[PDB]
């Protein structure tokens, strides 16, 4: 058993970007990959998604990728590649839109998508056991602690509040929709 292609390619992309951040500085990578911060950048379509590929420290990237590997891994194995692509795109896009609306375009990380995945895997298991996917009891707890640490800013760092709430909402919404 191993991570399928979508789980993998997101992990490598995040590592490559993280490397480029270390060599170039975070600011140079943000100039290229951040949500449009000027009207001249509005048609550079990748920017609505690529904010998800940027991480600002070792612990930031590790925690983001650990959850992705587990939850993304589970979605891809049980529901296939296509579904993970769509969940990721929608959560990246929406989480990004809510975050910039709250606090402007300077943000990054995969935690919008992760909060979506947590919401999605959980609610799909609850509403639709015949799907073949669910969030195991123990991880429900650790996921629940993660969400609490987001709501109350317990991570010891500047938080993308809009990305987190929008991400969680989307995962729940997509689960609801798929469970019909």
């Amino acid at each position: 058993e191993r991570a399928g292609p979508v789980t993998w390619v997101m992990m490598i992309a995040c590592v490559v970007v993280f490397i480029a951040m270390q060599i170039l500085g975070d600011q140079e990578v943000m100039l290229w990959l951040a949500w449009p911060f000027d009207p001249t950048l509005k048609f550079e379509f990748w920017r609505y998604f690529t904010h998800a590929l940027m991480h600002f420290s070792l612990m930031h990237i590790l925690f983001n990728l650990l959850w992705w590997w587990y939850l993304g891994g589970a979605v891809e194995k049980r529901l296939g590649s296509g579904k993970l692509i769509v969940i990721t795109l929608i959560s990246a896009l929406l989480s990004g839109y809510v975050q910039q609306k709250f606090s402007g375009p300077w943000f990054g990380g995969l935690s919008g998508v992760v909060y979506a995945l947590m919401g999605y895997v959980w609610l799909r298991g609850e509403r639709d056991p015949q799907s073949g996917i669910y969030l195991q009891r123990g991880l429900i707890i650790f996921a629940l602690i993660w969400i609490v640490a987001g709501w109350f800013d317990l991570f010891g760092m500047s938080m993308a509040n809009g990305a987190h709430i929008a991400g969680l909402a989307v995962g729940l919404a997509m689960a609801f929709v798929d469970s019909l």
Partner: peptide, 5 residues
């Protein structure tokens, strides 16, 4: 500080 997602 940049916001962490």
């Amino acid at each position: 500080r940049v916001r962490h997602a």
